[PDB]
Amino acid sequence: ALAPRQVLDLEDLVFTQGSHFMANKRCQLPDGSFRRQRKGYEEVHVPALKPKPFGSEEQLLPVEKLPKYAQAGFEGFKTLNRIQSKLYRAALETDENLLLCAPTGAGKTNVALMCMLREIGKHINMDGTINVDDFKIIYIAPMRSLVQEMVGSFGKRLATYGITVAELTGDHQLCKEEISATQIIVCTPEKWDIITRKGGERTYTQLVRLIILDEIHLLHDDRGPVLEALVARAIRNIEMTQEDVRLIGLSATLPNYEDVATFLRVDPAKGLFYFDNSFRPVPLEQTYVGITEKKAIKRFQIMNEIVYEKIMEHAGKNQVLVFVHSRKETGKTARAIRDMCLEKDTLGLFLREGSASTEVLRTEAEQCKNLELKDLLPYGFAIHHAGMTRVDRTLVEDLFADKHIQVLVSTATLAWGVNLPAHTVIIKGTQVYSPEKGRWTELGALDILQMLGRAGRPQYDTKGEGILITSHGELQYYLSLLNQQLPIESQMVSKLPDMLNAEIVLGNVQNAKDAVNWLGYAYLYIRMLRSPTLYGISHDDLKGDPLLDQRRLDLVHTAALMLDKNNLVKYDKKTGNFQVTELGRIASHYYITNDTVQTYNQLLKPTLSEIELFRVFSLSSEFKNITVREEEKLELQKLLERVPIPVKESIEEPSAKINVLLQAFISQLKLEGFALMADMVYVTQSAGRLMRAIFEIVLNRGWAQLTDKTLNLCKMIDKRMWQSMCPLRQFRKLPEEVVKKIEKKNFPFERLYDLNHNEIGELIRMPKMGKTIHKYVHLFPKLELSVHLQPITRSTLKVELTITPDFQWDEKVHGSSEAFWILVEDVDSEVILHHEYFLLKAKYAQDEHLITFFVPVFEPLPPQYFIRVVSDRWLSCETQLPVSFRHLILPEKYPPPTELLDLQPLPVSALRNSAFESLYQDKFPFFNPIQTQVFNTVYNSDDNVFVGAPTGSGKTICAEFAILRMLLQSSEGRCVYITPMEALAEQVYMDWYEKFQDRLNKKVVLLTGETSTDLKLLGKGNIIISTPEKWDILSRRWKQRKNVQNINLFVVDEVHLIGGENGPVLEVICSRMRYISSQIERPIRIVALSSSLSNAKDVAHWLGCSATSTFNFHPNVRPVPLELHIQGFNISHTQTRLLSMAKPVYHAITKHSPKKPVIVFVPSRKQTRLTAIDILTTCAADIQRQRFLHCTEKDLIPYLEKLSDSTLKETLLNGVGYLHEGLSPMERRLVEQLFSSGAIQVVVASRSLCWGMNVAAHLVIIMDTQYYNGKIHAYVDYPIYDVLQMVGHANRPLQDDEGRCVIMCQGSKKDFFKKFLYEPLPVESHLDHCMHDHFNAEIVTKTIENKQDAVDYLTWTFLYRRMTQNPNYYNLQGISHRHLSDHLSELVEQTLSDLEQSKCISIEDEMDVAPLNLGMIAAYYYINYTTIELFSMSLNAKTKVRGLIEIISNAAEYENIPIRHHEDNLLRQLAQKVPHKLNNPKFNDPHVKTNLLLQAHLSRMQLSAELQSDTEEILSKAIRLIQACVDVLSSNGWLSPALAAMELAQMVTQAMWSKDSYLKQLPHFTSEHIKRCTDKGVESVFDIMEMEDEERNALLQLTDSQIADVARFCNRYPNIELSYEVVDKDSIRSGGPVVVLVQLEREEEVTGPVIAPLFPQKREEGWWVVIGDAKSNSLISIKRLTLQQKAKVKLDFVAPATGAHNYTLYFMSDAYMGCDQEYKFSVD
Ligand SMILES: N=C(N)NS(=O)(=O)c1ccc(N)cc1
């Protein structure tokens, strides 16, 4: 972006005066102007503008004529203004941008209220009052008092609608619970500026529909720029969001209004309104005076003379008000008026001619006041300023509204924050004091205009009188300010650098080019275009650049050079690109000037003292022109000794002045010099932001001591107290005296925790205060800290800090939340090696919290680290914990990785078989380096090999390599491929089916999970592939299963998932395969593919891999090089961090792959949709439009014509695809196909899909890297394996010479990612935590029998190898073999005891153990022992279907069922729809969630997509669990419970409740036809299949495809007749075996599987035969069977004594409802 540009002296082009850069050469005094000179005391008097007619339809509109709802806001008014009528039409009936130029006091408020009511009534419900969570309105006001007046009045007006208005302007910040529950935010421009330059501005700006800007003439003021800035951002955002917001502007009658109309994007014909002062609310006659020379006495006395004359002129029923510029001047005015009244015969008295009483009566009666109120109130006068109480201020205001107070002198605050008008207004002088300029200046425009607009009460005056007193040399200017002739200019050039940085930091300006465009968005651009001479531009240069390219480029270049000098931004001369500094980011977010940044960066140091800290604070360039006046030096010397910090920096120069003023603010020391008070206030209202800025600067750098100093200084400024004082001062309902008494005694605060209330009262000598002191002591926040550490590597330790609360919560004291900083410091407490922002919410305030993070350690290992948790707001609220590293081992360091040499790549010709080459020659001509190296050992050496290489580097085909010789050595061999994830298994199954059974014609299958079907598929396949669970349940019985023994090849992929959840299953199945290879004496070849592991040798020796077969490569030695970019976001609240990272993903796309494909991963599905849409709208804003679409819309139309999601159609035809599990697999494969084709450039995917997508990009972006766990009501970091898979998705060697990935994460995590992603990953076993189930399952198979071989088994585990090299990770404190064996024996003992207490095993002596019924059926159904124990203890003799479902939902396998954000609310909603209602339900409990899901499924209820996937996950194991329940119910002998359990099985199959019609089971059916049938006679499916064809088809009244789909279910319906015989019936007596034989016939053969559309897995008929006694509720015998036409069943059971033994024979199903039989019989 090279272009000619020259640096500029911005001082020449800036209007130095500001506020009043007089562009008006001469003010044309109106008609009726006379100038009576009196040598000073001149009177340039203009008349009141006479009224105007109502000619052109103009009329005061009746409030009843308004739209009916909007009449609520205008209640109390029976009409509205003329301006208000024209604007009623415009504003209430249109959404057009508006700009109202009207004189001061003309109304303004009510027209903005109409604009608000537009939006308020847009979101109406039919009978719901409003949609508060849908629209957010804001109101920008120039002064704080105006903000407060506005929020009060607007609340009063529109409370009827149910809206909530509030003020955000205050010294507090980062507190935003009110922004959530307030629909109309009133704020100052700089407030909204600091809010909307914060990252994640959308959190506030998302629901913004209406932006009002009151008193837009602020553009001329020095505060002008921020306004511009605001508008610019807003407008640009309404372009980037494509969500229109309405801009309302309110200005006074001043010129250049058309330019701000262009600025505000108002149509001059539709939204531009201008009213000259003939539309003034009360016609105003004004007089201006001048001063002759410098005579203070003369000035003040002449002011007083004018005041006395004009006040006396308005004696009765009139109020002549006076405005002063200081609180020392209102008292002086009262004094002077009273005195010169007295001096001249005390005349003017009895202004209220009812001297006896009237108003004097009420004044004296209400006289219980202070200061100068009690004397001037009966006299008739009054004063009003900020240094008064609320009661007395409101009392003066009331008695003035009562028109009983006559004269009132006040300051500008009354004119801004109170609706208090008067007949006459006298501006006493116009010189005010500015601490910013450090000098006396002239007043601002807004003050003068608001004050002189107060003249003339609205309904009580026919004419007003404004009187202004100033100097002569200013007259012509004030004449311009009050007669529509002072032009509005732009002060942007002086504020250009700062502003520019705020846009560089905000990411809205990445180059100088969009900087220039932004400058075009400003008011400065328009104002330069239409008056270039006063902006430094010639009329010829305007011809050269009509769009002013050169001037805007020069300006942004100067600002960028300034920001580069001060190091807020790095700016390169050539490309014109910007790069943000953390200095600049802090400067923007904390609203501080770049010179201050430079001073900080050159002065702040880790060894800085608190004295030097106060000095640096005083050197801020916000105070660079403050002066030490002689009139205050003695008071400064007095304050210096009364403050604690030395202030050695100087003597009595401005830095020492600032310092001592701040310390007098902290110490609450009173002052006397009024200029000194003004300067103090000006320093203190900024000191908070300045100190927070310094604190962030030092925190990010890790400097610990300065961090503590600075945070404490922030809190001392906030709470108005030093650290020497007692923290009890922070409770503001405590006395000052009592806390001073506590401080007098040298008893530290902490010991009050361990003290009686009576002993407290005795210590303080105040017994009555002791109870409340104890209360507040236990209300003070204190945290308990507990730590669990486990080494990960010699450089990194995993820490699990457990934060426990230890105080009473009070919403008044602590509010909705309490913030904390977690800090990890080294031994010297110098360097902060890690830190985090913790937040204790109010709801979970008493729950325990767990914080996992990682710290670094380097040898020589220090004795201990420190972990401090320090409150962000409370002083002396720190809890420290030393973590000792004295008994900590450092894990055995890993060796270097197997180097990949630069060897000639092997072409496909090395693979000699032509059919084998066929597949690999159609893709690539030669192999990549790592697979060229691994080829020798894998495909041609029958060695056990482990290859470790980054994800996506093409390691999969390496397995194929081995497989090749596999198929070469055996005809119909048996190889087993094991992958941890299911979706990866499905992808590799499709690929290898295409590669083998469809190409080589060798049967390749993937195990489905059902026992019989999977064991059948086992024998067929030459290649069987599976997940570790389906393979575990098959291989656990490797004695009876012959097929699992003759396995030529076992390949396990992604073995590094041993360390993740569901990892112990992989570990045990691999160890079992190794043990089988040992026993069979036929060495099963093992080949393992994994990521780059550090401890790859351990897993290599685990599987018998020689070092000639270990292939573990440094992750840098990828086939495709990768450029990783970790990018931190120091933002806590994740819902706002996502909105912040919004724009960075677009800028990352444009930076790292502007044309090439990208994948961006997000933590949700709604996030996939939203990210797709926001990328779309940003590309529309840039008008790139087709940047992400590389084909034609007509090319896609046929494809997208079959997609069901409308937004997916739109986003796809616009270039970007989204992949979320809320849509069909067909849509997923379609989007993947379009992406890999090149038509779709970018795809945004849910995290859950990072395993099952066969899609490669050039750039992989990751968002957030956190997801919400609602079981702990917090956010969890991603598993490292997921993000590593995502990163591996970035390397494709098809096209690119490089791979690019950027991860966007909270700062707390950044370091973490970096390290573990740049170097190999250490992995360990979690088998010791999930070991009991495998012992319970291998006692059943007799593989384990005693304790010694239970120890022998662990030798096969990876756990055995890892417990040695990393002891402390498994909490063993030794590395000798003694420690190993001791830990193993303790583990086996613990597991066996836990299993015995569960009634699953029996132990005898100390060796031999034996299975029990519970453990046998727990291993038979692959069910956890806890679930079986719970089943056995909970199932009672009389358990009904409701209790059946309850006990089912409590299973441990359903604890994995998660709880996500806002999901507790959805479960609350579902609780009232399900037929059975459980009391005392906790809605973050997975078990009540599963119960609700089961009740909704049985009731055939549709719900969310995530909840549907969860319902599928539960239904997968539902039948397993209910079969286990049937078995234990049989083993305990209860009859009707087991019958109800079989009923529950067949209920969960086809989603039928227990007592609904059986007709509900056939498909294509709703309740109306079952109502017709059951009312007319058809009650069962047998009635359906008994009817003739035509009478049924007529009874159906359905389509021809419906009858065809009904017939298939009516045919699959089992039709079985039973045959039962009691063998040797005549030969039966007591105690003898009784044998009942049962036989079954099925007319049709196995036509197909069980038909159940609402069940995900295709099941097969399972039947149950039962012998029961219906009276004893006794189940005698039972058998489950699988039926194929012919059956033969036997049931043997003993007999009791002779009696009426009437038995029942039950035939139950586990699938269908209504095909169950009950036959009574008798045997004696
Ligand atoms: N970045 C780290 N080390 N921690 S943080 O939670 O992300 C964080 C949060 C907020 C602020 N202001 C700074 C930092």
Author numbering: 402 to 2125
Please quote the paper that reports this structure:
We identified sulfaguanidine [4-amino-N-(aminoiminomethyl)-benzolsulfonamide], a known antibacterial drug, as a ligand of hBRR2T1 in a crystallization screen with additives (Silver Bullets condition 12; Hampton Research, catalogue No. HR2-096). In this hBRR2T1 crystal structure, sulfaguanidine is positioned at the interface between the two helicase cassettes, directly contacting the N-terminal HB and IG domains as well as the C-terminal RecA2 domain. The para-positioned amino group forms a hydrogen bond to Glu1097 of the HB domain and the guanidine moiety is contacted by a hydrogen bond to the main chain of His1236 of the IG domain. Furthermore, the binding is supported by π-stacking interactions with Tyr1238 and van der Waals interactions of the benzene ring with Trp1222 (N-terminal IG domain) and Asn1531 (N-terminal RecA2 domain). Sulfaguanidine occupies a different binding site displaced by about 9 Å from BRR2-inhibitory compounds and did not influence the RNA helicase activity of hBRR2T1. The primary hot spot (16 interacting probes) is located at the interface between the cassettes, coinciding with the position of known hBRR2 inhibitors. A second hot spot (13 interacting probes) overlaps with the original sulfaguanidine-binding site. While compound 33a efficiently inhibited hBRR2T1-mediated U4/U6 unwinding (45% of the unwinding amplitude of the DMSO control after 2 min), we did not detect any effect of sulfaguanidine on unwinding at 300 µM or 1 mM. Sulfaguanidine itself did not bind to the hBRR2T1–hJab1ΔC crystals.
BRR2 is responsible for the unwinding of U4/U6 di-small nuclear (sn) RNAs, an essential step for the conversion of a pre-catalytic spliceosome (B complex) to an activated spliceo­some. The ∼250 kDa enzyme is composed of an N-terminal auto-regulatory region of about 400 residues and tandem helicase cassettes, each comprising two RecA-like domains (RecA1 and RecA2), a winged-helix (WH) domain, a helical bundle (HB) or ratchet domain, a helix–loop–helix (HLH) domain and an immunoglobulin-like (IG) domain. Due to its essential role in each splicing event and its association with the genetically inherited visual deficiency retinitis pigmentosa, BRR2 is an interesting target for the development of small-molecule modulators.
